[PDB]
Structure 1
Amino acid sequence: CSLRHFACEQNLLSRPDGSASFLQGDTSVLAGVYGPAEVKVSKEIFNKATLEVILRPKIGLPGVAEKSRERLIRNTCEAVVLGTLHPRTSITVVLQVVSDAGSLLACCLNAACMALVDAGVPMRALFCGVACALDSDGTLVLDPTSKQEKEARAVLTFALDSVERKLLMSSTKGLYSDTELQQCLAAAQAASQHVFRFYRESLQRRYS
């Protein structure tokens, strides 16, 4: 098990408030965030903000699947953003899929996290994305590729906190037993320790 090549770039676009492109290997996702701004009166809430997440694929038009994976991303960012400090305003997250090579949701979560961090939004704790794919026998592989995803009998994706490494989001494909669910959760907890180091080194370099 070994995470593949990682790269990231910040402040690409001049129009939004914060931009961050996160590509992990061959797959890539671009994201941008507009800071706290005005909100339609029919959707505003007092003592809280409103999070809006929309996802755009590269081929075709969004359907039921993209909104079902938009709820997860919105309900994951909702648990780490201190909205009470900014009521009667709106926070929006937009995700664009540039290339797909496998484990897209984890790269989308990392793109969203780096865009929120770049945009200067009050946050309670950072979050990560780790995807596991155990093969037809039980050999765990971390950060797989669509070649291995096609052959694998089960694919799992987790979102992990940056404080005590708890579980925030979980979407699973395939059938399995609980023992290897525990061992892939432990592998995810072991994997996030390097992504958070990549986060810290990137922001330490930014303020050089």
Structure 2
Amino acid sequence: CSLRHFACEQNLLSRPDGSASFLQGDTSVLAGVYGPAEVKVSKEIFNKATLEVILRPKIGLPGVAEKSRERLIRNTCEAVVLGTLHPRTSITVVLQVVSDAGSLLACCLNAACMALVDAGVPMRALFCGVACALDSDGTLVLDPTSKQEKEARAVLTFALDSVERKLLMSSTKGLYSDTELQQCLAAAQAASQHVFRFYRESLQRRYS
């Protein structure tokens, strides 16, 4: 297909509320959610649940880029996740990068969504993440590989929604143009359709 073999697995870990291992190709992320739980008077806010994301790679320590990425994920989830139901409590999303082969965010987002699902957390709509790489010649590639990201001039991670296939998040590396943005966004929408079909298949086989 236009994008590569990608699988998932739910309820791996016993201690966290919900967990999900989402791998595509050779990149594999692992997400664990701690549902509505305690929160101190400093971190909390009435009429909303505090969503906190902490992402940590498997090398060195977390610096700044990961903090930016986890802000992106935080706000995306705040966009979809319902929090006016569970005020004065904290939802926590932990992300670990078992492997890194490009298309990282496009994997972390999917894993976060699946974990939130497994934790039975009230969501307004599923979301997904894809990554499209524009080489110099304009030929785009979906769900790229690290080689394709290095040999390319632009890369674009889009976090889309399921209800109306809008654009919840966009993180771009490189420099690109308008028309290319639009066309890669359309291709991302198609890829998101495929990802949603996959989610439904996985959950169908989980409830069986």
Q: Shorter-chain TM-score category?
A: over 0.9
Post-superposition offset of 1:32: 0.6
Tell me the TM-score normalized by structure 2. 0.98
Post-superposition offset of 1:65: 1.0
Partner of 1:85, secondary structure, is coil
Q: How many percent identity over aligned positions?
A: 100
Instruction: Provide the residue aligned with 2:192 in structure 1.
Output: 192
Post-superposition offset of 1:156: 0.5
Distance 1:75 1:184 in 2: 23
Post-superposition offset of 1:135: 1.0
Post-superposition offset of 1:66: 1.0
Post-superposition offset of 1:111: 0.6
Post-superposition offset of 1:45: 1.0
Post-superposition offset of 1:162: 0.3
Post-superposition offset of 1:70: 1.1
Post-superposition offset of 1:136: 1.1
CA RMSD of aligned residues (A): 0.8
Instruction: Map Cα deviations across residues 137-193 of structure 1 (whole Å, 9 max, x no partner).
Output: 011111110011110011011000101100000011111110111100111111111
Alignment coverage as a number of residue pairs: 208
Q: Which runs of 5+ in 1 are unaligned?
A: none
Distance 2:22 2:197 in 1: 15
Instruction: Provide the residue aligned with 1:29 in structure 2.
Output: 29
Distance 1:72 1:177 in 2: 22
Post-superposition offset of 1:64: 1.1
Trace 1:31-110 onto structure 2 (pairs within 5 A).
31-110=31-110
Distance 1:199 1:12 in 2: 17
Partner of 1:2, secondary structure, is coil
Partner of 2:142, secondary structure, is coil
Instruction: Map Cα deviations across residues 89-122 of structure 1 (whole Å, 9 max, x no partner).
Output: 1100000010111110110000100000010000
Tell me the TM-score normalized by structure 1. 0.98
Q: Which runs of 5+ in 2 are unaligned?
A: none
Distance 2:16 2:55 in 1: 17
